[model samples]
Target: HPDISVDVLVIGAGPTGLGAAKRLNQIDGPSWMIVDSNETPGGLASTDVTPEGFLYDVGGHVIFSHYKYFDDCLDEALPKEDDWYTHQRISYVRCQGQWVPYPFANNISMLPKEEQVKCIDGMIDAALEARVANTKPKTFDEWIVRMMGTGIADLFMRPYNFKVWAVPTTKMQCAWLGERVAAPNLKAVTTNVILGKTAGNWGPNATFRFPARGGTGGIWIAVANTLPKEKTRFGEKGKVTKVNANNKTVTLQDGTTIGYKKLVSTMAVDFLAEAMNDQELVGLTKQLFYSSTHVIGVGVRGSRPERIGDKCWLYFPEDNCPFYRATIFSNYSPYNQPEASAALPTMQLADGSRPQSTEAKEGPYWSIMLEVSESSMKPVNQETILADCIQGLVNTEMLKPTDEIVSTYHRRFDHGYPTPTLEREGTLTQILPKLQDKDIWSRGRFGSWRYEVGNQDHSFMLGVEAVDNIVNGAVELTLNYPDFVNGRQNTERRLVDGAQVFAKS
Candidate 1:
């Protein structure tokens, strides 16, 4: 006899899982339940609070929605006018002591004169070569050279992407570069370099939204609240222990079993294969590799610096910092830290030295969240990660050695960014369909293992589309056609009304 029964079982309560639950709740068609390993609803989208009351998100999670369903669901959760803050993305790429406007290939004017000349020379060559070329670039390295020229590839694309993805450019595939990379126009780039003009903002995340309180995780928790309490479970008790795909049952950590006709799993696919005890699937998942992420947060006691004025996030390509990216976290929202009136004492100096005074004082504060990617190829110094990051801040000129550090946060997420390797699509083509054939729709950041559709908004829609596919045989655009979905506004689905308008069809 089954311990419990449901029409559908949604495993994992991250954005994808929450999206599944939300859709289930709205449709009222499936007797569904969502389970997660953690006590909270947000997976990678979750936020961590420091002992000193400062808040930091998993990585830099800025909401830039392409779907109306995403907007509707968030609006329903936060509701009030004061619930969110909107800001223009002030992003930059750090290259040789200068802040180059992002899509570094497009901003060649920021480089040294010789470097700029090198970049333009190659761009002209690539353009002439493109006139006769017919085949797609074989690898990410090839794509970079063919698109942005050898100069930009050597200077930024090759090294910066290695730091961000924790994998060499030659090992990655270029198909996923659809909208993520901005290929510089030869005429425009040459003109910019000659005329000494920096290119303007150039990506989808140019404008974004943040919660006024509780950080990125707050948005998920609010969305979770909108669902039926009985249908959702969290924490250790909510952890899934086993999935019997053949038997159509999932056993929880507490030994309770839930029988289901269909399963929408949002956990890591590799982990899910192990849970299901599928040796063949496990072997297949091994072919796909990924890196972990270490998020280091530092809360400093000082007024916001004029130099750091409203900058949203910065990228680090140089070796001066261990981090690949740094978010001026406090600038996202004033409530991210304690109010100026709230008194707080210095925990230590920025260099990890003892504070001069033990006295607690009240005043303004600011914080920065840094991200470092780790893999076997590029391992982090885990023992001194915190100290190293602090020192890195000083090296990058983000912090002064004597700055008072009130709080510090450091955490390592095992499965952070899903790397797009040469073998990624080949593995997914085999793995995803096999699971789906067994009534398991595996989807999410690590679940689907596709970085192209792994952002917060995309993950949510992965779940939404999974449900639609299961119920009505709808096309899973986000999962199957990442480039198509990412290329334009996806307005077919609505979270609030549970309607799929299919604007394209």
Candidate 2:
């Protein structure tokens, strides 16, 4: 016999699951429960702290929200102004040993004169071609060349994207790039070069917020705290071992059985399909591709370098570094790493030289977090990755040969970025509705596998809107109309102003 039954069973405690639970709780209708395998609430949005005191998020996560309700809920959880740290996005790209302001093609003025000419030539061509581009871009690579031209595509977009996605541009589709990619202006780029000016920061996350204390995970932890403990289960109690879709039952690792009228699965659809023993669903999930992420954290025992300045994150397109992106983690929050007085031993010198002394020394510490995407095509040597990445850091001029490295962290997440392959939409559209017909709601970043609306904000709204659809037949604007919501400010419901989304039947 099943131990428990609920009107809704929300699985996984990441932003999406939490959003489902929040909406369900807010409704105060239908018996519902939330469960996650991890002891903590945050899934992909979680953060880790090194034994030596440096904090690292899953990757770079800054909350520049799309929904007012999302802001309200977070505000309600961590109400104090001091609980968060907001920053202006200070981003750059590394190429030809020079730091170029972000939106690389848009700021091609910062590039060498020869490269500037290379970019503008392509930009002009792309502009001319746009007039007759009646048909939609078939793939991401085509979109790059079509919009930015061969010069920018060849010099930056193609290589940087390959490094970031760990999937060939040809394999991905263009639909996922609504505002995520800063499609450069031909005139703006050319003018910037002549005027010696660069493009300003632009995007959904141009200026974002982070937690002051526990890192990205801390925010979710606080969010989960806002929920009723009686309805929440984590760790072994929530570890779902098998999902019997036919019976509408999920069995946990401890042999406890849970039956649900509706299941909101925030787990990666591939893992969920496997759990369900659904061969057809499994086949469908296989069509949707993904890449793994290796997060390498380096906690150094020294002052923040002037070279890095107040830069938030840096991008790399060249092969000198295995990483596609590096975040100056210490620049985000004062509490992100240990205090200046914290004592730490140097593991190695930045120049690939042996540490002169293994002795523990006082530090005014700083940190850097790097992300390397991997797949079948871009294979990673897990054993030697730490050594290789550190060497790459030196090669990129991020670190000097003699810089002291106090602590290092390496973690591999199996499901990182959801690859927006050409087959993704067809697969997800075919599968998701069929799952819905079975009273299973597969939604979230990985659950839905829509990178365009896959930020933390969009993910949470997916769950929220899913519940609204279930209860009130409300349209899920975030999930269905990603481009619509992403292009505009979503001020529909403001939590800060003490507003409620649902005051109707």
Candidate 3:
């Protein structure tokens, strides 16, 4: 039982909590400890394994650092040159039964002549409107049409986003977009179309590195390894059940009471508010919204197909697939699935037909991980989601209708994304300040509720910056000024022998 007190108490050993612990230890001041409900670290950043041995991450979780500190931390965790596999982010959008290079707006050049005319026509209309536009877009929908034009909005942006966000674009706000959605340049796109060329891979992760073993979860486990184990808790022993802001203490699931000078919570803010037992906080937080994520995995027996060769992730904008995106899990790491010799029975055929033989079969397996977003705005039929996804995979030509499915996985996460609704910023503005008065800092992907700065790199830094603010009165650039930090590389800190060597310090 943790009937103890500390200067810093971190809740949730995910990236955010881990970040706080990392910074708290590096500063080398004030007693501190971190706790998580799970048996091990890595919250949404964790990995899962089926009995068949294929590995899957909480989601896609590609790593692209905006901070040198983030890179340094990762390097320390997996130190060997052979510890990582660097790969080009070979991504595409499945539209009109054809594969289009990602950044779908910019690559309209690759579309058919008739469709190209439709996209370019809208682009010209949007350009003409830009000459007289004086007001900011009121909603993400307006922003999309204004920037990419109605054609792309209808063809890709709107449908693709609804599939991903599980909410209508009209209800979402435009302010959270920061270096995420690429806005096409009119002349450049037209020139590319005329010259028959496609743009290079866009965004921070044109190329990324993955661990040699374990899935995305391996990275976070290694990160947790660098911290002092005595100061960390996991499993039921660390599960936080209650947080009393007024008394400045937290109660674990096992009745362990941990008091603190300040609390750093990485759980979803809505859940945190409930744990704190603050009805007012909960009421206000309820105004903030989120969507659920259903991650489905299918492991099949056979060699990696040439049709899916070297593809990292694929986007789906059409209704041909129930999933918004699909990643070739095996492509990321050699050990993501079971070795070829393992015996496993076929789950079912993709075409809703039974496998010829139910007996266990063996030799070489490959897998695909798919994500489907759900919300009140867009409900998912959980009962048949797995089967529907497999059929969708077949519909989209990702899998052969008669492919041997050796294993299947399906899990739902309630708080998958912090939906940037029109009310989000205003709600956060009020909620954060009130918690701040109680010496409580909530920071993480769902912790802060700012999707703009909610990537793995951004979430990890949110924790680091929150602690800096708590200890050194530092401003949280990532949380408060998302665009500023993402606008350029952050060289403020580097690692030296597993320690942060701050540029200012």
Candidate 4:
């Protein structure tokens, strides 16, 4: 007999799992429990604090939530206005030794004169081709040419995506780019190039919020606390060892078994397939591709430099830097690093030179968090990545050769950005429905393997909607209709509403 039985068993305590548990508790319709391997609540959304008091999140996470339910939950977690900091998205791209406004295709006016001519010529060619074309884009590469033309494609789109996804644009599908990528206006871009003016900040995250303290992971910890303590399990007691779909039972690493009428799995679908020990499901999941992410953080002892200024983040398309993106992490929150009064010894200079003295020094400090993607197609030298990143910063002028480095952080997430490869759609179609037939709802960022709706908000709602579907056949909008959710603000359900609209019907 199983040690415990519940109407629903949620595996993993990240946003997705927490979302499920949240809705389940609200509905009060099912006897359910949530479990996670880590003692802490956040999964990939979690943050880590270095021994030097520098904090680094899994990667860049900005709160531009799409759902009101998500907003209410987050606000409820950190209820005070003083708990958050709001900032303009001040982002840019590095190219040819100059900074261009983000959505690089829309701001080609910042590029060199010769480069501008090449881009405009290609835009004209692409516009003409679009007039005669009868078929939609076949892949992401085609979409780039159809939208931004070959010049921008060759210069920025292709290279930057390769650095971020670690996969060629040609191998990825375009349907997943619904609202993620912005298409340039031929007339507007041409006019801007002639006038030599850049475009304004555009996209959903032009202004966003961040926690004033505890970083991104702190938000999840607070969210988890709002739930019933007795209904959650963490650490070794929550480590799932085996899943028997046939018996609707799961065994944990600590010699306990749980049986449920329904299972909500938030782990990577590939890992879930393996845990089930089903060769067929495992084969299906193999078709879904993913790239790993290496997050490297550098803490420097100085005021925020003028070059970096209030810029939120910067992108790199050229090979001078290994990272595709660098976030001014310290600018997001004052508490992200140690206070100005906290003293810290210099580890080394940006040029890799040893410091003259080992004594700790005080004053203001700043940090930059960089992200590098990796896949079988794109290999990375893990051992030398830190040294390489420091030099890359100097080459890109993000750091000076003589700047002192006080602290550093490097972590590699094996299942990082879920790749939207050409084979992804077909594989998900077969595997997800099969799992559903067995009462397993494979949902979440990696669970669904759909990058389109994989943000913190979308991931949370994926769990919320999955529970709705299981309880009353409610449609999983974020999962089945990502375009709908990403296209506009989702105000369907409110956290403070009198009753659950999608409650058991």
Instruction: Report the number of the highest-TM-score candidate.
Output: 4
**What clash count does candidate 3 reach?**
3
Winner on lDDT (3 vs 4): 4
TM-score each candidate: 0.96, 0.96, 0.95, 0.97
Looking at candidate 2, the ten consecutive residues that score lowest on lDDT are 496-505
Error of 1 at 209 (Å): 0.9
lDDT of 3 by residue, 294-390 (tens): 9999998899989899888999989978999999989898889988888899878878788999899886999999999999889999999999999
Each model's C-alpha lDDT? 0.88, 0.87, 0.87, 0.91
Which 10-residue window of candidate 3 scores lowest in summed lDDT?
495-504
Off by over 4 Å in 3: 179-184, 200-205, 496-505
TM-score of 1: 0.96
Please estimate how well model 1 matches the true structure, expressed as its whole-model Cα lDDT: 0.88
The TM-score measured for candidate 2 stands at 0.96
Q: Which clashing pairs does model 1 show?
A: 38-235, 39-235
Comparing 1 with 4 on lDDT, the higher-scoring candidate is: 4
lDDT order of candidates, best first?
A: 4, 1, 3, 2
Q: What is the C-alpha RMSD of each candidate to the true structure, in Å?
A: 2.9, 2.4, 2.5, 2.2
